Structure 1
Amino acid sequence: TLTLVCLAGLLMLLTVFGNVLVIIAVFTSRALKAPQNLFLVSLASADILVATLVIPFSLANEVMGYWYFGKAWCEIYLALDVLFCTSSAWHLCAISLDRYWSITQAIEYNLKRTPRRIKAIILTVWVISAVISFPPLISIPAEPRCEINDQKWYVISSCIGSFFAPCLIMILVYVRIYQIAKRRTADLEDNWETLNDNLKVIEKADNAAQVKDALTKMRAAALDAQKATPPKLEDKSPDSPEMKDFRHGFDILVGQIDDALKLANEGKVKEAQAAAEQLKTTRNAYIQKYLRQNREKRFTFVLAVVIGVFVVCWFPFFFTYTLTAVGCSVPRTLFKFFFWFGYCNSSLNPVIYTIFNHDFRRAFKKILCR
């Protein structure tokens, strides 16, 4: 009934509450690099702009509302509701492009990733997003009963121009990103699995020979693993004590395999598997902390999760809105749900942001207390 008028504005403030916290979190932090911050703050600035200037009207217009103090309100209301979503999609596209270029072009791109360069990128997103939003000689006096003239021709070019094409690209480059990351870690993950497999085989073994062969197996696996670069220690020197801690760790391990190999040949089947558990624990304490993903890999994956919500929130709306050109299915029950679903995308960006990024939780708890 009337309980819902406050809920939407309540969730509308959740964008201000959520995104402004991010706006100032990255605003001035020695940990936050300026290249990435610029993009996450203009994205959070579009969300904080649409939650205030466009969000509330959609609720009243949805129940007991019409354009007041002129249709000019219905002019800008349409124009910003496309602008933010065309710019938000295109921003996610550019971060998608930034993440790809950084992972591949390496030193050269870092030289060109000047904060001024990426500042220029954002303004251009606003520029080109304003072109897709501005209609040529076509308007989106008395009350007009605010909706969008569903010109089948224009609508789809804009429907694609706002959501489809930018989302398509950002999906298309991130699938290349995933394949690259999977290729790097592949061989090492072979080894780590082979270690774990032979370990369980050791604990799940009944005779000494089975253990001895399992042990000899992992011995090569560890040596093969010893020559990889673990994910955290990517682009670090072998002068870095972390990269050396990795190596010493597999020396220490190999030795323990050999010592456990002496027990299996001595005929002490039980002592062997016992000592094999000691191998496992040692491996975890030495190695596990380096299998964790690098600092740049976290940012790329976390924005992979963000594209997951831009697709999940907006695709139902745009796909049902695109189908209206052929008018196949029920809009009455679905339009309302999908119009909100796409809209909550702006409030839920800092939600996934702190839910996954380790720097986010601390930046959220330290922004408030100061």
Structure 2
Amino acid sequence: KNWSALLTAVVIILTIAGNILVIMAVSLEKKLQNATNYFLMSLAIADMLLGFLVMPVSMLTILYGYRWPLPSKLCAVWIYLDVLFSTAKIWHLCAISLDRYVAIQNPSRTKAFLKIIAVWTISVGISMPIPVFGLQDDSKVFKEGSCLLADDNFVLIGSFVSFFIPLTIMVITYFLTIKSLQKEAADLEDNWETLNDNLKVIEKADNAAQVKDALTKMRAAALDADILVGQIDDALKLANEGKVKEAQAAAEQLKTTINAYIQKYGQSISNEQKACKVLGIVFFLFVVMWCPFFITNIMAVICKESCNEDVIGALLNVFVWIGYLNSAVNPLVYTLFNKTYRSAFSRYIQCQYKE
């Protein structure tokens, strides 16, 4: 008689339906066809595959008191799917953080589907000791007729190698991305005063000194931020001949090109900080929900002697569902914090699929 299967059946269908909707939204709606959204589909494939393959077998074992109810050579395989799909999500979340960072030092699907194939192959490579050695020796994958990783080298080596190369690189490249977008906003409303200051200088002017210097100083300050470089140069010639009343009126026709360009760049940055913050929640929820399973699984190995493994085991059976639930919640994040995903999901529920 088990309570727990009534709970766990919820988490599986949330996982399956939501991650299908994310897969559906990137496949269909054109305003999601960018490289960072191509990763989020691949992530959702992993979360949906976790929900189809790994999670109902976990529920099944809950209904046999953890005494493993299937063929023995499926235990080593099930473990490989359970580790792969998670190792897939951590190298996904690392890649997005890293790819958006290299995007800031810069001015395609084949961009993305090489990088996704690069990440999946580093997951398939890293998880591959499990069935190659587990299918040889049933005592890497079974303890006491319960299917679970029973090799501590695979846990210790896998956890740090598979989760601390990527987490480190993800938490550095997330932090540096925040600092790159803070310097860009700082550097742009620096150029605001420099251009704006100099406008008030050219409108006050007496002579061709105050106009030619203050368009020289406008031009280099324009060069830090395309088309307005010519429009300063189209007005830099008027002051050089001495046409001062003409260059002053040409500059209030620069004021409109300036206000138009600054706001567009400024909207783009405020977008990309809202977008950096959405991932940061996808990133934050992943660690925090796996955090109790992770720490306890490592302490299983560290205090084999000094601790009640019945209690340690009774928590791992509980803590692994906290991290399963993480599959369910990536889609909810998008629903409340993207207009684009919410509008799309709200039309797939109305069975209406034409952009």
TM-score of the superposed pair, with normalisation by structure 2: 0.70
From the superposition, tell whether residues 121 and 245 of structure 1 become closer, same or farther in structure 2 (CA, over 3 Å): same
Aligned twin of 2:111: 117
Q: CA deviation at 1:245?
A: 8.8
CA distance in 2, matches of 1:120, 1:60: 37
Q: CA deviation at 1:37?
A: 3.2
In the TM superposition, what are the counterparts of 1:271-350 in structure 2 within 5 Å?
293-327=269-303, 331-332=312-313, 334-350=315-331
SS of residue paired to 2:32: coil
Q: CA deviation at 1:73?
A: 2.5
Preserved contact between residue 2 and residue 63 of structure 2 (Cα < 8 Å): no
Q: CA deviation at 1:53?
A: 1.0
Q: CA deviation at 1:333?
A: 5.1
SS of residue paired to 1:54: helix
Aligned twin of 1:42: 42
From the superposition, tell whether residues 292 and 30 of structure 1 become closer, same or farther in structure 2 (CA, over 3 Å): closer
SS of residue paired to 2:301: coil
CA distance in 2, matches of 1:323, 1:315: 12
In the TM superposition, what are the counterparts of 1:170-185 in structure 2 within 5 Å?
170-185=170-185
SS of residue paired to 1:324: helix
1:92 maps to a residue whose letter is: L
From the superposition, tell whether residues 140 and 4 of structure 1 become closer, same or farther in structure 2 (CA, over 3 Å): closer
Preserved contact between residue 23 and residue 45 of structure 2 (Cα < 8 Å): yes
Q: CA deviation at 1:102?
A: 0.7
1:84 maps to a residue whose letter is: F
CA distance in 1, matches of 2:165, 2:141: 21
From the superposition, tell whether residues 117 and 167 of structure 1 become closer, same or farther in structure 2 (CA, over 3 Å): same
Preserved contact between residue 22 and residue 331 of structure 2 (Cα < 8 Å): yes
CA distance in 2, matches of 1:56, 1:79: 15
From the superposition, tell whether residues 360 and 100 of structure 1 become closer, same or farther in structure 2 (CA, over 3 Å): same
Structure 2: runs of 5 or more not aligned:
135-139, 200-224, 230-254
SS of residue paired to 1:38: helix
Aligned twin of 1:137: 133
2:331 maps to a residue whose letter is: P
Q: CA deviation at 1:335?
A: 2.3
Q: CA deviation at 1:172?
A: 1.3
From the superposition, tell whether residues 11 and 336 of structure 1 become closer, same or farther in structure 2 (CA, over 3 Å): same
SS of residue paired to 2:31: coil
2:346 paired with 1:365: yes
1:122 maps to a residue whose letter is: I
CA distance in 1, matches of 2:31, 2:295: 40
In the TM superposition, what are the counterparts of 1:253-272 in structure 2 within 5 Å?
none
Cα RMSD of the aligned pairs, angstroms, is: 3.7
CA distance in 2, matches of 1:23, 1:336: 29
Residues paired across the two proteins, number:
291
SS of residue paired to 2:30: coil
SS of residue paired to 1:344: helix
CA distance in 2, matches of 1:350, 1:163: 23
**Could you give the per-residue CA deviations for residues 239-259 of structure 1, whole angstroms, max 9, x where no partner exists?**
9xxx949838x9xxxxxxxxx
From the superposition, tell whether residues 4 and 323 of structure 1 become closer, same or farther in structure 2 (CA, over 3 Å): closer
From the superposition, tell whether residues 238 and 358 of structure 1 become closer, same or farther in structure 2 (CA, over 3 Å): farther
**Could you give the per-residue CA deviations for residues 6-51 of structure 1, whole angstroms, max 9, x where no partner exists?**
2212211101111111111110222122423321111100100111
2:6 maps to a residue whose letter is: C
CA distance in 2, matches of 1:64, 1:362: 42
From the superposition, tell whether residues 144 and 131 of structure 1 become closer, same or farther in structure 2 (CA, over 3 Å): farther
Q: CA deviation at 1:221?
A: 11
CA distance in 2, matches of 1:353, 1:179: 24
Aligned twin of 2:161: 161
Preserved contact between residue 8 and residue 59 of structure 1 (Cα < 8 Å): yes
2:127 maps to a residue whose letter is: S
Q: CA deviation at 1:68?
A: 3.4
Aligned twin of 2:213: none
Preserved contact between residue 87 and residue 129 of structure 1 (Cα < 8 Å): yes
SS of residue paired to 2:146: coil
